[PDB]
C-alpha cells in the first residue's frame, strides 16, 4: 500500500507544479521596468550604546519608538533610552545562553529564552519599584529561536524540535501546536492583523499558519540551504527570506510562488537577519562579512552599505514610525543609524 | 547645563547602573570555562560525579581556581547551529570508553566524532584533553577476545600496553593542527584525584600563554 500512496503523492506534487506554472504569466522584473532608481543611500551613526561585555544576539524596539531592549551572552538584559543614552533598567538572567527577546505592545512586560528551553516573562511596572519574573513556559523539547507577544495574555514561540506553540500566560498552558516541518525552525514573523504568521526552517521551506484554526495553509520552497530570517511586508501580502547560500528571495501569498532574487557574485557568506522599511521599498539584511547591505525591494540592485562593525552582524530592526535603525554585532556594541 | 532636576536624577541613576555592570564584568572575567563532549555510555557521568532542560552547568573550586563546566549531551539537535556559542573556552574535555570496542562498532563512531571536533573552524587554537576510561574491563576482556576485530591491520602482541599505545596513536593520528594546539591523553583512575590535577596542570600552561600574549612579548 506504500507504493500506491507514494505514487499518489507524486501525482499531487506534479499537479501542484503544473498549477503553479499555469498561474505564472509575467515576471516581476518586467513589470517594475523602466522605473527610476532610488539612488544611493548614505547613513551615519547617531548613537553608540556601550555596556555589554560579550556578543549580542537579539534586540527589539518598543511600540513608542523611543525605548528598546537587547540581550547578550553574559546574563544581562538592558532597556535603553534612545534619545539620551540612559539605562532605564538592567535585568540579570538565570541562564547565560539566550537567543531571543521581545517587548510587549502595552509596555508592561518583556520576554527572553534560549538553550534552557524555557520562555520567561518579566513585569516592568510594579508598586515596589523593581522588576521581577512572573511566568515561565516549559513545553518545548528543543532550544528556543524566537518569540512574539500577541497581547498582554498571549504569546507565540518557535523551537528547534520542529514545532511551534501558542500559550495562555494566565494559566501557563499550551493552546495550539503546529507540527509540519522536518528541520529545525529558525524564525517567525507576525502579521499586522495578528491572524496569521509564517516560519522558516532548515529543510529549506516556509509555511503559513492559521492562529485560530491551528492548521497549515501553504508551503514554499526554492532555497538551497537553511533559512535564517523571515519578515512580513507592511500590507501583509508578502514576505522575505535569507539563507546560508548567500541569497534572498521574495514570496507572494496569493500567487503562492517566488517573485524576486537578491544576490551578488562577490558575496559568499550567509545572511543573519532581515527587515523592511516603513513603505516596503527598502530591504535591509545583515551578513557574515561584517557588513549590512541595503537592497531595493522592487529592483535587484544594491542601495547602500553600513560598514561600522568589527565582527558579525547579529540583528537589526526598524522603528514603528520609521525614523531610525538599530544594529547589533559580535563586537558588543549597538548603533543607531539615521 | 540645559537640564532639569528630573534629567539630572536620571543621569545619576544611569551612572549607578554602569558602575554595577563594570563590577560584575570584572568579577566574572576570572573564571575558567570548560566544555564536555562525548558519545553515549562513554563515562561522562562518572567523571562528573567524581569531580564534585537542555544544558546542565557544574561549578567547583580547586587550589584557588574557579571552574565551570557545561555538558550538552541531551540536546539531540543540529550541532552546527549552536556549536559556535561555546567559542572562547579554555579547553575541551573529550571522553572515549576503551571497553566499547567489541560492540557499526562504537569505536569508529567515536573516532569520527573526534575528527569532526578536532578540525572544526571554531577550535583552531583550543587545546583538547583526551580521556580513556574502562581500563580494567578492557584488560579483562582482552584475554577473552582479541583486538584484531576492530583493527585487522593490527599485528602487535595481545598485551594491554601495546594495544593501548596503538589505540592512542591512532587517535592523535587524526590531528592536522599540530602547530597551534596540543592534545593531552590520560587514563582514568577510579579511586584517585589525578584527573583534577591533570586538568589543572593542562590549563595552567594555557593561562601562561594567554598572559604572554596579553603582555605583548609573544
Amino acid at each position, epitope marked *: 500500500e506504500l507504493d500506491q500512496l507514494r505514487q499518489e503523492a507524486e501525482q499531487l506534487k506534479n499537479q501542484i507544479r503544473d498549477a503553479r506554472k499555469a498561474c505564472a504569466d509575467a515576471t516581476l522584473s518586467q513589470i517594475t521596468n523602466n522605473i527610476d532608481p532610488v539612488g544611493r543611500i548614505q547613513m551615519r551613526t547617531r548613537r553608540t550604546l556601550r555596556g555589554h561585555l560579550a556578543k549580542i544576539y537579539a534586540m527589539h524596539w518598543g511600540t513608542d519608538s523611543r525605548l528598546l531592549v537587547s540581550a547578550s551572552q553574559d546574563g544581562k538584559l538592558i532597556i535603553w533610552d534612545s534619545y539620551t543614552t540612559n539605562k*532605564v533598567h538592567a535585568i540579570p538572567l538565570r541562564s547565560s545562553w539566550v537567543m531571543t527577546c521581545a517587548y510587549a505592545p502595552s509596555g508592561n512586560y518583556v520576554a527572553c529564552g534560549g538553550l534552557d528551553n524555557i520562555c520567561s516573562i518579566y513585569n516592568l511596572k510594579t508598586r515596589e*519599584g523593581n522588576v521581577r519574573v512572573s511566568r515561565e513556559l516549559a513545553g518545548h523539547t528543543g532550544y528556543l529561536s524566537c518569540c512574539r507577544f500577541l497581547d498582554d495574555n498571549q504569546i507565540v514561540t518557535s523551537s528547534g524540535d520542529t514545532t511551534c506553540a501558542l500559550w495562555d500566560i494566565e494559566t501557563g498552558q499550551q493552546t495550539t501546536t503546529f507540527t509540519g516541518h522536518t528541520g529545525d525552525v529558525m524564525s517567525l514573523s507576525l502579521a499586522p492583523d495578528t491572524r496569521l504568521f509564517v516560519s522558516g526552517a532548515c529543510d529549506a521551506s516556509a509555511k503559513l499558519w492559521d492562529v485560530r484554526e491551528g492548521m497549515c495553509r501553504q508551503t514554499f520552497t526554492g532555497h538551497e540551504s537553511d533559512i535564517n530570517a523571515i519578515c512580513f511586508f507592511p500590507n501583509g501580502n508578502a514576505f522575505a527570506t535569507g539563507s546560508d547560500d548567500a541569497t534572498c528571495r521574495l514570496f507572494d501569498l496569493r500567487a503562492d510562488q517566488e517573485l524576486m532574487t537578491y544576490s551578488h557574485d562577490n558575496i559568499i557568506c550567509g545572511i543573519t537577519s532581515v527587515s523592511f522599511s516603513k513603505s516596503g521599498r527598502l530591504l535591509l539584511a545583515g551578513y557574515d562579512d561584517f557588513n549590512c547591505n541595503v537592497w531595493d525591494a522592487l529592483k535587484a540592485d544594491r542601495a547602500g552599505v553600513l560598514a561600522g562593525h568589527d565582527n558579525r552582524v547579529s540583528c537589526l530592526g526598524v522603528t514603528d514610525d520609521g525614523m531610525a535603525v538599530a544594529t547589533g554585532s559580535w563586537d558588543s556594541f549597538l548603533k543607531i543609524w539615521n | 547645563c540645559t537640564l*532639569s*532636576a*528630573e534629567d539630572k*536624577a536620571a543621569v*545619576e541613576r544611569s551612572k*549607578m547602573i554602569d558602575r554595577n555592570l563594570r563590577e560584575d564584568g570584572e568579577k566574572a572575567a576570572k573564571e575558567v570555562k570548560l566544555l564536555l563532549l562525548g558519545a553515549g555510555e562513554s563515562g561522562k557521568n562518572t567523571i562528573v560525579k567524581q569531580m564534585k532542560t537542555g544544558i546542565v552547568e557544574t561549578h567547583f573550586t580547586f587550589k584557588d581556581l574557579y571552574f565551570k563546566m557545561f555538558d550538552v549531551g541531551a540536546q539531540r539537535s543540529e550541532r552546527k547551529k549552536w556549536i559556535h556559542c561555546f567559542e572562547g573556552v579554555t579547553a575541551i574535555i573529550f571522553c572515549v570508553a576503551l571497553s566499547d570496542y567489541d560492540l557499526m562498532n562504537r569505536m569508529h563512531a567515536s573516532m569520527k566524532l573526534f575528527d569532526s571536533i578536532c578540525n572544526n573552524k571554531w577550535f583552531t587554537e583550543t587545546s583538547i584533553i583526551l580521556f580513556l576510561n574502562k581500563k580494567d574491563l578492557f584488560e579483562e576482556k582482552i584475554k577473552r577476545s582479541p583486538l584484531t576485530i576492530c583493527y585487522p591491520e593490527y599485528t602487535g602482541s595481545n598485551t594491554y600496553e601495546e594495544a593501548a599505545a596503538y589505540i592512542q596513536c591512532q587517535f592523535e593520528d587524526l590531528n592536522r593542527r599540530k602547530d597551534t594546539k596540543e592534545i593531552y591523553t590520560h587514563f582514568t583512575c577510579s579511586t584517585d584525584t589525578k584527573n583534577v590535577q591533570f586538568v589543572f596542570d593542562a590549563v595552567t600552561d594555557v593561562i601562561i600563554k594567554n598572559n604572554l600574549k596579553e603582555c605583548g612579548l609573544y
Partner: single-chain antibody
Amino acid sequence: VQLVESGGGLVQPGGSRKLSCSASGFAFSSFGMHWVRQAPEKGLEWVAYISSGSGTIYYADTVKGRFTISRDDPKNTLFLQMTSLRDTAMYYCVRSIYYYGSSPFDFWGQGTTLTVSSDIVMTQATSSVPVTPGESVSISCRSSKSLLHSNGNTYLYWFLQRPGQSPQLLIYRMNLASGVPDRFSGSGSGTAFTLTISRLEAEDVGVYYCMQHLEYPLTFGAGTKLEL
C-alpha cells in the same frame, strides 16, 4: 507600602531634636526622600531632600545651616537633625523616584507634630468655593514663571488633603495617577492651569494644592476649600 515618622513633642526654645522615619514594603535603596512641612493654619512648605545613593542633598533657605538630613539604606531609615529651634508645624515624609516615565511624589506619610514653647510664586485666587453633588467644578492656579521646558514637559502637580488625612497625588506633570477615578482631568497653558472634575462626589470634599518641580526650591500654592 508604609512610611511612619516619629519624634515631636514639646521643646523649649534654643534646643535640638531629631526625627526619624521607617520605610517598608518597597525597595527603599532605589528611592529619593523629602521632608515637607505644614503650619497649623497655613499651607505646605518644603524642607529638605536627599538623593538615592547619597549623591545630592538640598536645603531650604529659611532653614539652611541648622538642619541635617541623612539616610541608612541597610536599615531603611531616614533622619532629620534640627538645632537651635526658634518651627511649630506638621512634618511629612515623601518618597520619589526619577527616570523616564516615572511618577514622583506618589506616596506620603502620616506625619508627626513638633511644638516649641528669585523664587517662583504660586498663588490661588479662589477659596471657599460652594459645590453640590453632580455639578462640575473648575479650579485654576497661577504661576509667576513658565513651567514649560525645552524638552517638552510642564511641571505642575495636584494634591488632595481630605480632612484629617495626609495629602494624596492626583495628577503629575500637569497624566492621571494610578488608583484614582477618571473623573479628574488636567489641562493648562504655559502659565495658566485648570483642574476639572466631571461629576462631584461626597469623597471629593477637601483642599487642593498646586506645586511646581521646575527648579529648587519647591513652592506650594495656597489652599482652595470646597464646601457642600
